[PDB]
């Protein structure tokens, strides 16, 4: 069995290997990359996402989100307070202001310590989930706006034709902006490209051990767990690496830098934080190996998780028994 310790693998595809996306995901899996839940892909040196970023300040962040924490430094939840619209230019200035900028630090490790120690005492502002793309239309390889769609995958594998579309989203981050512990909708894959700016630190639990994280989360957030049997779908819970180690939860960590791709694999729980102003683009995707995960994915039916239009058909086809209850939570 490849990668039995479930380490995060890092790949360096050649320009020839970078042509066929599906093929290279399958190659990574042949090497056991999926066992980690997360892999890093460094693009060949000849590749570029676009010519320059000199022209991005006019993008609008219609609903910036202030991430307000409650709890203790290692175990907290966050809620999103909506703020008034601002341009990327305005947001980048805010990020770099004395109130929000990255503190002096020695290295990534020192900064990680400062994050876990101090995150709860501040409320950074995140420009998340902005439909759009920063890839040049002429970038042919690993262009997140030109991937094969999940609907087409399900049609190819299962023969059914369904409605829905699949497009990428932009994320503008600053110091301490946070992604809570989650798997993707319907336990899909995700791919994330860090277009510019400061790094993003990731934590991941191997898919084969996801239920261990879920058990801990029920223990740590006991009122949340009573309200909903899939409350990690709410994307509000944070658990530090120290707490995970104390409770024996297997996990790994890695820092993504500008110009690098990360792939999350089905049912790979992940969480993390941004080091300073940055812009990432991400999109969900499927492969034939995903279908069995989609069929088993948990669902939030309490009303909180509220998701895209396209998840309907996934639930309808893959999880017909659950569909009526899940849709009640959507309506
Ligand atoms: O970049 C972020 O804030 C969070 N991204 C993801 O969870 C992802 O790409 O799956
Ligand atoms: Mg612009
Ligand atoms: Ni994710
Ligand atoms: Zn719920």
Swiss-Prot record:
Alphabetical keyword list: ADP-ribosylation, Chromatin regulator, Dioxygenase, Iron, Metal-binding, Nucleus, Oxidoreductase, Transcription, Transcription regulation, Ubl conjugation, Zinc
Binding site for Zn(2+): 228, 234, 300, 302
Localization (cell): Nucleus
The enzyme's E.C. designation: 1.14.11.66
Location of PolyADP-ribosyl glutamic acid modifications: 16-17
GO MF assignments: chromatin DNA binding; damaged DNA binding; histone demethylase activity; histone H3K9 demethylase activity; histone H3K9me2/H3K9me3 demethylase activity; metal ion binding
Cofactor details (free text): Binds 1 Fe(2+) ion per subunit.
Maturation and modification: Ubiquitinated via 'Lys-63'-linked ubiquitin chains. Deubiquitinated by USP14 with the help of TRIM14 leading to stabilization.
Essential cofactor(s): Fe(2+)
Major localization class: nucleus
Domain JmjC: 136-302
Signal peptide: none
Catalytic activity: N(6),N(6),N(6)-trimethyl-L-lysyl(9)-[histone H3] + 2 2-oxoglutarate + 2 O2 = N(6)-methyl-L-lysyl(9)-[histone H3] + 2 formaldehyde + 2 succinate + 2 CO2
Residues annotated to bind Fe cation: 182, 184, 270
Gene Ontology cellular-component annotations: blood microparticle; chromatin; nucleoplasm; nucleus; pericentric heterochromatin; site of double-strand break
Family: Belongs to the JHDM3 histone demethylase family.
Annotated protein name in UniProt: Lysine-specific demethylase 4D
Organism: Homo sapiens
Taxonomic lineage from the root: Eukaryota, Metazoa, Chordata, Craniata, Vertebrata
Residues of the whole record sequence present: 11 to 341 of 523
